[PDB]
Design a protein around this ligand. Structure first.
Ligand SMILES: CCCCCCCCCCCCCCCCCC(=O)OC[C@H](COP(=O)([O-])OCC(O)COP(=O)([O-])OC[C@@H](COC(=O)CCCCCCCCCCCCCCCCC)OC(=O)CCCCCCCCCCCCCCCCC)OC(=O)CCCCCCCCCCCCCCCCC
Ligand SMILES: CCCCCCCCCCCCCCCCCC(=O)OC[C@H](COP(=O)([O-])OCC(O)COP(=O)([O-])OC[C@@H](COC(=O)CCCCCCCCCCCCCCCCC)OC(=O)CCCCCCCCCCCCCCCCC)OC(=O)CCCCCCCCCCCCCCCCC
Ligand SMILES: CCCCCCCCCCCCCCCCCC(=O)OC[C@H](COP(=O)([O-])OCC(O)COP(=O)([O-])OC[C@@H](COC(=O)CCCCCCCCCCCCCCCCC)OC(=O)CCCCCCCCCCCCCCCCC)OC(=O)CCCCCCCCCCCCCCCCC
Ligand SMILES: CCCCCCCCCCCCCCCCCC(=O)OC[C@H](COP(=O)([O-])OCC(O)COP(=O)([O-])OC[C@@H](COC(=O)CCCCCCCCCCCCCCCCC)OC(=O)CCCCCCCCCCCCCCCCC)OC(=O)CCCCCCCCCCCCCCCCC
Ligand SMILES: CCCCCCCCCCCCCCCCCC(=O)OC[C@H](COP(=O)([O-])OCC[N+](C)(C)C)OC(=O)CCCCCCCCCCCCCCCCC
Ligand SMILES: CCCCCCCCCCCCCCCCCC(=O)OC[C@H](COP(=O)([O-])OCC[N+](C)(C)C)OC(=O)CCCCCCCCCCCCCCCCC
Ligand SMILES: CCCCCCCCCCCCCCCCCC(=O)OC[C@H](COP(=O)([O-])OCC[N+](C)(C)C)OC(=O)CCCCCCCCCCCCCCCCC
Ligand SMILES: CCCCCCCCCCCCCCCCCC(=O)OC[C@H](COP(=O)([O-])OCC[N+](C)(C)C)OC(=O)CCCCCCCCCCCCCCCCC
Ligand SMILES: [Cu+2]
Lengths: 49, 67, 343, 53, 56, 49, 55, 58, 49, 148, 63, 50, 188, 126
């Protein structure tokens, strides 16, 4: 249960990361490899966890 | 080579395209200069100055600052 | 203490060897954030899904000039064209200087290459040219509608009508390297093909001539060797194999005019030999039993005689082409082994 | 005793499988699936392979 | 559609068979590999017959 | 292109004085670089304040 | 020295702990004593009486 | 050393908080808890803590 | 992946690209990696470091 | 968005009748905390779009990302070791049922639950690959799919 | 060999060969390079055996 | 490009080439030169030394 | 529906967990309760912000997706400007102005994707790119949505950069693909 | 004659392999992944084994272009295959009767569910 609590907090963190990324790309008008790949690797890490 | 044929615009400035090949225009305005091709790019300089200045260090969005 | 100054001078160039080359692997934008590999956390940089272009030329610009280039696309195009012209001039001057240096001094030495590698390089060049031609044709077919809009309606109507005529009440049996898509392309571009058919066989012959006349494959520039051997050893192929290689790559060592003369002589002699009665009878016998030979993979006597005549004709072609060579002994061609005859 | 038998069989298996499977298996590296002769495809280190094959 | 595809398959098969059966007559293939193969087959047959004769 | 043969003649102790002397090689003057550029560089405006 | 000591401690105390984890039908006490002998008879807390006169 | 040891102390203290508030009984012998596990986890960091305090002094 | 220099290169990144493409000593020294500096000789009056 | 958020907030406050002064003070503190934490990153993003994002900066950001995830992984690994070595009563008399408590979950049920995450990562990889020849407007479809 | 040559002409015999060729054509793979140095770096790496033949390496003493 | 014969002869007479070109551009062909793309670098005063 | 109605009924209108809540857990069955958890009410900002930002992102990305498509296009008098009507966030009309000179139909960067273009079909879509504003205009290829007396001039003016050389050069035009440069002819 | 088969190696096992001419004899009229990768491999091998620098550089540019084209083709293939796989997985689990009759002993802890120690947990007699 404690491990799953940690997993949920990590998933909330990566969800906030993705929200920030989408908002920033919407403001800028284009997507960028650094942030896009960071979000992809966050998704991979959360999948592993 | 396929030179630009004609520009049907009253603005004589736009007639610069007639002096260049179509391949040149594709290379320098469509493939790798797509975001820069035939654009003023003044916003690039404005954003550069905004980023490099020492303005208030309280940012809300990419467009506006915190109230 | 050397206080380097932001300038291009021989004094600064004097310290070029005193710096490590700047690493490019960490430059640009990376499509991989970081490697989650404990085995190479500090040995491997992040990999890239895409490629790194190498056709980029950089030129320095002042701040005001760069602002002008950004603001004014016309000025940007003008300066870009001028820089391209100057780059062409610089490249041509460098090539001329290299040619003059080579003429004055001479090549450093001969290139140690294998005959198999040489032949494979020539074959790969031919295949690359053929693939380029095929890609050009396919791209033309795909972009016909966008490049030629005025005649697009008529050309498309003609192509569709011909395709319907072919595949409505009849099957289309294609021989050789011909397909329905290629037939459609030819029908669409009938007009242009009349001026320049660009036939596959003729184009292949011309591209082979271009590759062999480019001068890069001149045997004088190569020291043929086995290659697979531990020590450097000369080519160990038989004399017949060496002669066959020379005949195959005649164009490499001969100039355009001399090759034209020798090939014309050889072709005239071959035409006369074919016009001789025996060859006509051989070809008639070959054509006589075409239907029977199609029922089995085994050949007949009328075809074995034709093949023997082909071998004799190849030997005579070699002799005719190399007739005007003092350092050539044709007696070796008498009483050849089976392997030598096949070669 | 089992160790002796096993290692004798292992040596015999090496000897037998040498020409039967592995050597013919090496013929699959003569050319790539596209038909071009084998060439080096670096991963991270562009090792120099001037030596023949 | 189906008939056209079947005929295309049949045409390719027939072309392949015709090549396999008569590629030794022309020089379409570089180095005349099928022609050399047929010549080698005839040479082997003649050598076998002459070997029988020489044994006799 | 023998490396030893090249080096034995290229690098010698008795030529140390002239081997490491920096100089400007004699090359044809270029107007855009050796004529025009100095003029515009020296014509730059100067402000007291 | 510490690593060798820790390896011996593991061999005597950690790995054998997992050999038996459920009631055993046959020779349960024999197997338990077999696994416990190596751990309870270590020379560190057994040897020394031979030189007891030192103290 | 601090990087090595800090997570152990964090986990032990979090488990103590859970036992106090949610009553997870991690250290209650009644139903499987290990009171000595808390001491093990704490001291595993505690001794390296004093070593960390002393080493810079030298 | 390679940045469009004519569009985005300004100040620091422009200087880094200049160092990469020219290896001019000033730029190369400015952007030299901190992890490793080229090993040199032992300083002497005749051949100072 | 404002209508839905305010309605939800007011309903959730009303259902439990929270004390306004204390709860508003706590939420003000939380708001300032999060706002400044995110404003730092907003500043970083806004400043690095020109003349600041160099190779060193990119490597630094990669290192920070991996360091953060490494610290989280270490904490989770400590918790995982504790989970694996969780204590229990003696098996002989206190807890004789521990032998049959394997706590095995069905993979036939786990795979369907795991599908969405692999779908998301595959869509993200496709977006990364396609970014080289696509515009922002066209890729908003993939971005929205990933967000949903 | 004679029997194989005799049965080569049969279409039924060539059907299996056609299927095998079709599978071989469908069994193509690509092997990209995933390093920043990329094609130019690999090309410069593969120049060891040929650098010695370039003009710039010819012995030419300045003095 | 094409260089006038008289101009080339004048260059040869005035300057005799005795050293090889070090730049790799000498190997470039016309196709590669045409395919090359021009990029601009902004050069200004440098204040950051890191 | 999915984000508010079902979660609301599953969370507040029933204390009974769903199967996906605990099928992977090994706890005994138990009920829920909204009034015995998170005494600090830390979930209120979470829910509020998540709802607000999710709604904003959804609406903004819907608008971005629908922006490219063109509803109506009108040349101004003298055909110097083009007024374009586009979809708004709520599906209404929004006005924009473009320059015919800037408007251009560019070929794809990858030359193998030409066959994959929607324009390849008779009733596909035409992607016209505004090189000044870096925007894209999408038009149906169907002749129904076109004025048949201002279409030829428009396509001729907007399809200049898609030329024959995009497909390559043969050996007859390779030499002419570039303009020869004369050096030293005007002076030695 | 065992040596004639053991110590005698086939010519191809030692000498460099040639170009498979049948792989290029007949090709489709489509600029597809197969032709693109064939051209890429041809140019790559030529660059590897060629001493001619002038031809390589243009081949280098063409190889970069082919790499971009093959990346696009692989992106299309990945999209199609991944979408098909996900749809097939979803349909399989939609039309598949998931077993819901597995043992539920693990979820039951009678001693812990009903504390067997009762009041003795809070303290003994005194
Ligand atoms: C019987 C054993 C196996 C059982 C498996 C059972 C199934 C478990 C499934 C669980 C996961 C679900 C599926 C996830 C899919 C993820 C897909 C993906 O993108 O991932 C691949 C992705 C590809 O990497 P990349 O960066 O994109 O490219 C690298 C290059 O390709 C270069 O390539 P490379 O190969 O050289 O290097 C990359 C390599 C690197 O990976 C490996 O070599 C590991 C392979 C074995 C995996 C075992 C899984 C866990 C099994 C149970 C635990 C047993 C102990 C494991 C101990 C070793 C660490 C795994 O990756 C692989 O091997 C590929 C497959 C990896 C599968 C996913 C592994 C999940 C790991 C979860 C734990 C991570 C934290 C551990 C911290 C240490 C704790 C002691 O890599 C990973 O995500 C793997 C990360 C592994 C991290 C290991 C860290 C070890 C500790 C080192 C530091 C120690 C510091 C100590 C300090 C304090 C001292 C006191
Ligand atoms: C006695 C047994 C005790 C342990 C029990 C038995 C084993 C248990 C399982 C252990 C493994 C975990 C399970 C998952 C394994 C997955 C492997 C995998 O997918 O990656 C293979 C991957 C090879 O794949 P690859 O990179 O594609 O192959 C090379 C390519 O050509 C890449 O090409 P490139 O162009 O990218 O780079 C070219 C260059 C560079 O590419 C590289 O390989 C990169 C550099 C690799 C450096 C590896 C060493 C540094 C390790 C860093 C930290 C690792 C984690 C440390 C965690 C503990 C920290 C306190 O290539 C090389 O240099 C290749 C060398 C690789 C040879 C490896 C042979 C085996 C090791 C012996 C090496 C000897 C060297 C020569 C000297 C000969 C003798 C005088 O790495 C290796 O095979 C070497 C790994 C060595 C480190 C192992 C660390 C194990 C950590 C887990 C321990 C678990 C607990 C053990 C008991 C203790 C409990 C407290
Ligand atoms: C039990 C163990 C496993 C074995 C059994 C398997 C199951 C039964 C299979 C039965 C197959 C044979 C059926 C009778 C054929 C009779 C043909 C005939 O009248 O003679 C013409 C021909 C006479 O003409 P000719 O002018 O003198 O000489 C022409 C040359 O032969 C030169 O002619 P060609 O050789 O080039 O001829 C090619 C042939 C065909 O053209 C091709 O080569 C192109 C490829 C066509 C397909 C070939 C395979 C078809 C059968 C297998 C289909 C499998 C589908 C699997 C689906 C997925 C399942 C999961 O041309 C045609 O005949 C045109 C027919 C086109 C329509 C085909 C569709 C027929 C209807 C479909 C149902 C067939 C019966 C199914 C029975 C139940 C099965 C469960 O015969 C001869 O050459 C001499 C023999 C004459 C007496 C034959 C007496 C019967 C015994 C025949 C044995 C053939 C064995 C072949 C396979 C050997 C092992 C690889
Ligand atoms: C006082 C405490 C707070 C109370 C809040 C009450 C609720 C207010 C809701 C308002 C929602 C926004 C409405 C905007 C409308 C206008 C938009 C506009 O024109 O654009 C301009 C600009 C946005 O430009 P845009 O182009 O529209 O932006 C588009 C972007 O794509 C959009 O990007 P962006 O602009 O949002 O970017 C900023 C960025 C930066 O991030 C933030 O903004 C942070 C947001 C934190 C929210 C915290 C809420 C706490 C309070 C909850 C409710 C309390 C009760 C309310 C009353 C009862 C119920 C009715 O936001 C994010 O990206 C956040 C990512 C998602 C995170 C969501 C929250 C965290 C969830 C996970 C953790 C939750 C558990 C706690 C964990 C921590 C525990 C320690 O907006 C502003 O600059 C702000 C508004 C305009 C300026 C202020 C005007 C009024 C003067 C100030 C009055 C108040 C302060 C002074 C009082 C004293 C006066 C004397
Ligand atoms: C249970 C759920 C599963 C877990 C879910 C979370 C998964 C998270 C996955 C991502 C993060 C982890 C990825 C793997 C690790 C990556 C590490 C990495 O790259 O770090 C590099 C970082 C940053 O490296 P860097 O910045 O130099 O990287 C750049 C490298 N170049 C320049 C080559 C490009 O540094 C390190 O941490 C490496 C050095 C330290 C490594 C540890 C040494 C040992 C220290 C302790 C001493 C020994 C104690 C005794 C040990 C034995 C005890 C018995
Ligand atoms: C190169 C020279 C090699 C010399 C040979 C010896 C070294 C061999 C390699 C190292 C391992 C040595 C293990 C010795 C003990 C093996 C058995 C065992 O553990 O049980 C006995 C004892 C345990 O005895 P016990 O208490 O279990 O008794 C068993 C019998 N009953 C149950 C009846 C009581 O081991 C220890 O007590 C280990 C204590 C830790 C320190 C051990 C030090 C050993 C000597 C120094 C070795 C130094 C090597 C240096 C190498 C590098 C430099 C050259
Ligand atoms: C109750 C639930 C949880 C409550 C706590 C709230 C948590 C909120 C977390 C928000 C995370 C936001 C991350 C934004 C990252 C932006 C990076 C940036 O500036 O861009 C660099 C750049 C941006 O690049 P770019 O793509 O924008 O443009 C580069 C410039 N050009 C394009 C011109 C070349 O990105 C990178 O370099 C890529 C890697 C980014 C790695 C980011 C790591 C962030 C780590 C955050 C740790 C937070 C710890 C929190 C601790 C607990 C708090 C309670
Ligand atoms: C934080 C992220 C970045 C850093 C990463 C690392 C963080 C690791 C943190 C954990 C480390 C290990 C220790 C674990 C501690 C666990 C503590 C714990 O469980 O406390 C939780 C506590 C529970 O504590 P409690 O005290 O109430 O516990 C109840 C139990 N009794 C009664 C015994 C006390 O809950 C919270 O903190 C509230 C969380 C609210 C989350 C709201 C999410 C909303 C999602 C909305 C979107 C979904 C769709 C619906 C949208 C509707 C819109 C209208
Ligand atoms: Cu201590």
């Amino acid at each position: 249960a404690i491990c799953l609590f940690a997993k949920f907090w990590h998933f909330v963190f990566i969800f906030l990361f993705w929200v920030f990324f989408v908002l920033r790309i919407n403001e800028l008008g284009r997507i960028r490899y650094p942030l896009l790949v960071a979000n992809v690797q966050n998704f991979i890490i959360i999948y592993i966890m | 080579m396929n030179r630009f044929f004609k520009v049907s615009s009253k603005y004589q400035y736009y007639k610069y395209l007639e002096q260049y090949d179509a391949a040149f225009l594709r290379k320098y305005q469509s493939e790798t200069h797509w975001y820069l091709g035939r654009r003023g790019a003044w916003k690039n300089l404005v954003i550069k100055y905004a980023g490099d200045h020492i303005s208030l260090e309280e940012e809300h969005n990419v467009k506006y600052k915190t109230h | 203490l050397v206080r380097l100054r932001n300038e291009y001078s021989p004094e600064m160039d004097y310290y070029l060897s005193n710096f490590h080359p700047y690493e490019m692997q960490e430059m640009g934008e990376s499509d991989t954030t970081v490697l989650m590999s404990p085995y190479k956390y500090a040995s491997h940089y992040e990999y890239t899904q895409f490629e790194t272009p190498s056709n980029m030329v950089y030129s320095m610009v002042n701040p005001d000039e760069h602002d002008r280039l950004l603001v004014d696309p016309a000025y940007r195009m003008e300066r870009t064209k001028a820089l391209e012209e100057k780059y062409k001039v610089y490249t041509s001057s460098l090539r001329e200087v290299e040619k003059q240096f080579e003429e004055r001094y001479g090549r450093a030495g001969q290139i140690n290459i294998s005959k198999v590698t040489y032949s494979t390089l020539i074959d790969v060049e031919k295949a690359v040219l053929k693939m380029d031609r095929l890609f050009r044709k396919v791209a033309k077919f795909e972009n016909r509608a966008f490049i030629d809009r005025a005649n697009h309606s008529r050309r498309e109507k003609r192509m569709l009508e011909r395709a319907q005529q072919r595949w409505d009440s009849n099957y289309s049996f294609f021989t050789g390297s011909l397909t329905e898509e290629e037939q459609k392309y030819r029908d669409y571009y009938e007009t242009e093909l009349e001026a320049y058919p660009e036939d596959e066989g003729i184009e292949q012959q011309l591209d082979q001539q271009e590759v062999l006349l480019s001068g890069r494959y001149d045997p004088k520039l190569y020291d043929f060797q086995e290659g697979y051997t531990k020590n450097p050893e000369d080519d160990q192929t038989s004399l017949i194999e060496k002669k066959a290689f020379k005949f195959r790559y005649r164009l490499a060592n001969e100039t355009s005019e001399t090759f034209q003369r020798r090939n014309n002589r050889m072709v005239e002699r071959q035409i006369k030999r074919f016009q001789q009665p025996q060859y006509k009878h051989a070809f008639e016998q070959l054509q006589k039993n075409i239907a029977i030979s199609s029922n089995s993979g085994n050949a007949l006597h009328s075809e074995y005689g034709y093949l023997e005549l082909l071998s004799n004709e190849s030997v005579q072609l070699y002799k005719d082409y190399y007739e005007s060579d003092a350092e050539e002994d044709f007696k070796v061609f008498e009483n050849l082994s089976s392997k030598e005859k096949l070669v | 005793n089992i160790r002796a038998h096993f290692w004798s069989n292992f040596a015999l298996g090496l000897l037998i499988t040498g020409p039967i499977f592995i050597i013919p298996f090496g013929k699959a590296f003569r050319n790539l699936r596209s038909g071009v002769p084998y060439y080096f495809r670096p991963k991270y280190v562009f090792t120099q392979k001037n030596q023949y094959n | 559609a189906i008939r056209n595809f079947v005929f295309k398959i049949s045409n390719q098969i027939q072309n392949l068979a015709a090549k396999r059966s008569l590629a030794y007559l022309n020089q379409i293939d570089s180095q005349s590999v099928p022609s050399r193969a047929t010549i080698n087959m005839k040479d082997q047959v003649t050598q076998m017959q002459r070997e029988i004769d020489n044994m006799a | 292109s023998d490396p030893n043969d090249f080096y034995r003649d290229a690098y010698r102790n008795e030529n140390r004085w002239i081997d490491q002397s920096v100089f400007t090689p004699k090359t044809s003057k270029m107007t855009h670089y050796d004529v025009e550029w100095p003029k515009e560089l020296a014509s730059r405006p100067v402000t007291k304040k | 020295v510490c690593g060798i000591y820790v390896i011996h401690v593991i061999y005597n105390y950690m790995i054998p702990y997992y050999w038996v984890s459920t009631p055993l039908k046959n020779d349960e006490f024999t197997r338990l004593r077999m696994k416990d002998y190596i751990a309870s008879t270590v020379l560190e807390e057994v040897y020394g009486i031979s030189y007891a006169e030192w103290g | 050393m601090l990087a090595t040891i800090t997570p152990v102390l964090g986990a032990a203290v979090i488990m103590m908080a859970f036992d106090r508030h949610w009553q997870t009984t991690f250290f209650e012998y009644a139903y499987g808890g290990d009171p000595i596990l808390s001491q093990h986890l704490f001291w595993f960091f505690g001794h390296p803590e004093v070593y960390v305090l002393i080493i810079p002094t030298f | 992946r390679m940045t469009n220099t004519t569009e985005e290169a300004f100040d620091e990144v422009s200087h880094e690209w200049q160092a990469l493409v020219t290896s001019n000593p000033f730029d190369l020294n400015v952007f030299n990696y901190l992890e490793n500096t080229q090993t040199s000789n032992f300083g002497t009056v005749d051949n100072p470091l | 968005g404002l209508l839905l958020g305010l309605s939800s907030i007011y309903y959730l406050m009303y259902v439990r009748l929270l004390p306004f002064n204390k709860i508003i003070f706590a939420w003000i503190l939380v708001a300032m905390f999060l706002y400044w934490l995110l404003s730092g990153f907003v500043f970083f993003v806004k400043k690095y779009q020109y003349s600041k994002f160099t190779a060193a900066i990119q490597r630094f950001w990669k290192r920070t990302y991996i360091i953060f995830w490494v610290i989280e992984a270490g904490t989770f690994s400590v918790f995982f070791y504790l989970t694996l070595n969780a204590s229990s009563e003696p098996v002989y008399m206190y807890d004789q049922i521990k032998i049959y408590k394997t706590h095995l979950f069905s993979w036939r049920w786990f795979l369907i639950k795991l599908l969405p995450s692999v779908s998301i990562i595959l869509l993200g990889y496709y977006l990364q690959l396609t970014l080289k020849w696509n515009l922002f407007n066209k890729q908003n479809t993939i971005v929205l799919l990933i967000t949903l | 060999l004679f029997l194989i040559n005799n049965y080569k002409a049969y279409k039924i015999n060539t059907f299996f060969l056609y299927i095998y060729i079709y599978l071989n054509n469908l069994n193509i793979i690509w092997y990209p390079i995933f390093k920043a140095y990329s094609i130019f770096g690999y090309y410069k790496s593969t120049r060891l055996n040929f650098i010695d033949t370039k003009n710039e390496n010819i012995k030419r003493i300045k003095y | 490009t094409v260089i006038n014969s008289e101009f080339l002869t004048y260059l040869k007479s005035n300057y005799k080439i005795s050293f090889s070109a070090s730049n790799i551009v000498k190997y470039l062909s016309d196709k590669s030169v045409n395919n090359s793309v021009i990029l601009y670098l902004r050069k200004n005063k440098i204040f950051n030394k890191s | 529906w999915c984000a508010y109605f079902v979660p609301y009924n599953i969370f507040f209108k029933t204390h009974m967990p769903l199967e996906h809540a605990y099928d992977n857990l090994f706890f005994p069955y138990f009920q829920h309760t909204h009034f015995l958890w998170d005494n600090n009410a830390l979930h209120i900002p979470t829910v509020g912000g998540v709802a607000i930002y999710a709604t904003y992102i959804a609406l903004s990305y819907i608008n971005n997706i629908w922006k490219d498509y063109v509803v109506r296009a009108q040349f101004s008098k003298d055909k110097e400007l083009l007024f374009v009507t586009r979809v708004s966030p709520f599906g209404t009309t929004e006005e924009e102005v473009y320059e015919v000179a800037h408007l251009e139909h560019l070929p794809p960067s990858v030359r193998s994707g030409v066959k994959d273009l929607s324009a390849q079909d008779a009733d596909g879509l035409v992607d016209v790119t505004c090189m000044s504003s870096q925007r894209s205009l999408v038009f149906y290829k169907g002749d129904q949505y076109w004025n048949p007396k201002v279409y030829n001039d428009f396509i001729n003016q907007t399809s200049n950069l898609w030329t024959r050389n995009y497909t390559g050069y043969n050996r007859l035009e390779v030499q002419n693909s570039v303009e020869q440069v004369k050096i030293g002819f005007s002076h030695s | 004659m065992i040596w004639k088969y053991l110590q005698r190696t086939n010519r191809g096992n030692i000498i460099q392999a040639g170009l498979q001419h049948r792989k290029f004899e007949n090709l489709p009229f489509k600029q597809n992944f197969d032709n693109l990768t064939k051209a890429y491999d041809l140019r790559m091998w030529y660059i590897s084994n060629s001493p001619h620098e002038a031809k390589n550089l243009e081949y280098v540019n063409e190889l970069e272009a082919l790499h971009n084209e093959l990346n696009y083709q692989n992106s299309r293939q990945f999209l199609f295959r991944t979408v098909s796989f996900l749809l097939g997985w979803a349909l399989f689990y939609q039309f598949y009767e998931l077993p819901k009759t597995y043992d539920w002993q693990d979820t039951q802890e009678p001693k812990h569910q009903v504390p067997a120690y009762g009041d003795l947990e809070e303290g003994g007699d005194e």
